[PDB]
Amino acid sequence: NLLAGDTKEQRILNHVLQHAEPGNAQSVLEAIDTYCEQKEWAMNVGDKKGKIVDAVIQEHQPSVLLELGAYCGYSAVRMARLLSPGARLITIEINPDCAAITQRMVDFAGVKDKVTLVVGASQDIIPQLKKKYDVDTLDMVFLDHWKDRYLPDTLLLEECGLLRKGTVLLADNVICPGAPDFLAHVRGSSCFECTHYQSFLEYREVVDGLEKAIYKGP
Ligand SMILES: C[S@@+](CC[C@H](N)C(=O)[O-])C[C@H]1O[C@@H](n2cnc3c(N)ncnc32)[C@H](O)[C@@H]1O
Ligand SMILES: O=c1ccn(-c2cccc(-c3ccccc3)c2)cc1O
Ligand SMILES: [Mg+2]
């Protein structure tokens, strides 16, 4: 049932629970995007950049996906709705209140079986993925957490043997606000082949973009 509606996050979940079709992931995405366009801005990847994320998944067909930063579960629902039977999205969220919302959002959208939500800091969890979460390597990683953590987490994923030839990294917000150290690293390194996707900041007319970086191997 409903939450108190004290926080933006509770009000976003409440709006979905009251105003979206249960079990319909598309209806859920639309309800979040409408509310956030109309009522309260929120840091979801949103519909325009969401379309780019969709395209990346459609092209590369990942089965093992990792997301860094879940928030209210918008991108988790967005990516999971596209996955084939037996695909797995692991999503990491440091804030326990946000994680609780994300699980409710995932369940409501009908994609619970595809999602493994992990409460904790990416730098603590990423070392554990192989041994604790039965990961071999990752097919795709969506980076959309604190932007100063894009670089250290990418290096950590590599250090932990989670990246293979062909692993797709996709990073939100490489323009607004930017993650220049990450961007310099992936573009400058022969270990990554990069593609830039210019777009717009969620719910705004501000220019933004994502970067796709395909790992070439060490
Ligand atoms: C931009 S929001 C996530 C938006 C979500 N990807 C979407 O599009 O719907 C960023 C989130 O990352 C979480 N976060 C920041 N740093 C993190 C870290 N090191 N590990 C795990 N989560 C982190 C924050 O608590 C916040 O909820
Ligand atoms: O994941 C994200 C974290 C922060 N911002 C973010 C960072 C800095 C500014 C703004 C912003 C700018 C103008 C209007 C509204 C928000 C938004 C955007 C994201 O997609
Ligand atoms: Mg973002």
From Swiss-Prot:
Shown segment, full-protein numbering: 48 to 265 of 271
Enzyme class per UniProt: transferase
Gene Ontology terms: cellular component: axon; cytosol; dendrite; extracellular exosome; intracellular membrane-bounded organelle; membrane; plasma membrane; synapse
Source organism: Homo sapiens
Coiled-coil residues: none
Function: Catalyzes the O-methylation, and thereby the inactivation, of catecholamine neurotransmitters and catechol hormones. Also shortens the biological half-lives of certain neuroactive drugs, like L-DOPA, alpha-methyl DOPA and isoproterenol.
Binding positions (substrate): K147, N173, E202
Disease: Schizophrenia: A complex, multifactorial psychotic disorder or group of disorders characterized by disturbances in the form and content of thought (e.g. delusions, hallucinations), in mood (e.g. inappropriate affect), in sense of self and relationship to the external world (e.g. loss of ego boundaries, withdrawal), and in behavior (e.g bizarre or apparently purposeless behavior). Although it affects emotions, it is distinguished from mood disorders in which such disturbances are primary.
UniProt-recorded name of the protein: Catechol O-methyltransferase
EC number: 2.1.1.6
Residues that hold S-adenosyl-L-methionine according to the record: V45, E67, S75, E93, I94, G120, A121, S122, Q123, D144
Source species taxonomy: Eukaryota, Metazoa, Chordata, Craniata, Vertebrata
A Gene Ontology biological process term: mastication
UniProt cofactor(s): Mg(2+)
